[PDB]
Amino acid sequence: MLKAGVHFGHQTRYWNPKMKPFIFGARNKVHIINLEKTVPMFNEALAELNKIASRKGKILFVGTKRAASEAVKDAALSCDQFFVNHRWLGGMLTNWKTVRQSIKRLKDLETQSQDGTFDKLTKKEALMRTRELEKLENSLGGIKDMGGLPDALFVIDADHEHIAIKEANNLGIPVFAIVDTNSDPDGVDFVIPGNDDAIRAVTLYLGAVAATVREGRS
RNA sequence: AUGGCUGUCGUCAGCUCGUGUUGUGAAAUGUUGGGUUAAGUCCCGCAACGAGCGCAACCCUUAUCCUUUGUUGCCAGCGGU
Secondary structure, eight states: OOSSSOOOOOOOSOOOTTSSOEEETTTTTTTEOOOOHHHHHHHHHHHHHHHHHTTTTTTEOOTTTSSSSHHHHHTTTTTTTTEEEEEOOOOOOOOOHHHHHHHHHHHHHHHHHHHHHTSSSSSSSHHHHHHHHHHHHHHTTTTTTOSOOOOOESSSSSTTTHHHHHHHHHOOOOEEEOOSSSOTTTOSOOOOOOOOSOHHHHHHHHHHHHHHHHHOOO
16 A cells, blocks of 8 residues: 555664665665565565454554554554553563463452552552552553463564564564564564654554454454 | 580671573573662662562550559648648
């Protein structure tokens, strides 16, 4: 769907020479991504999603960037999928035997602090007991009811969330990511070259994948 | 040869483990960093996520008030002396 996008480059001072088949050097010292090679690779990753969304699987979206942080949360609860948006805990997939006891710790007191003994200890306990779920809810809020490990994983910037890509390479979770010209397209399975730090571009990329999973649910 | 008990650094703020990761490995990470605290005290950050022993609080005494009780303790207002 070659439309009026914004993704066309992300600096030419350093790049990533493994990102050589997607290069046009503009005279403003700016790399341009060849978009007519993106859309053969963009639609095939969404074609792999209907292979996976028909399995009644769990799609997990990760990307923070401080610009696409809130953009992935509303585009995941637009569907019934899962997200990590504020900060990605190191070892939330490989060490899920311990992180399971943290999302259980959250919903044990999310059960508690809505009805019962949220005010029956002190005020100074309620000064920090409201603080400790508001520490864990913006680290585990999209993942708290998943109850497993995802069978796909969507990254918005590859070298910014390389910790999440590498954990979905130890075990066979197929990660497919919006990579940039400075990112490294080797840990990603279904590489799609695009824009990682533009708002209207990341809503175009994520509005497509949030569309294709709910129409893919037959 | 030891048990039990005790000194000491020193009431010093430290000492570790599980899992995950990194490294061929001894190991490292966590526990470092930016602040803060009497304190590994707390917060923010961060391939770490958690937990344990300490730290703190819980215990006793002292500092204030109230209630109950009024003797062998007490005397403000009352009578005698």
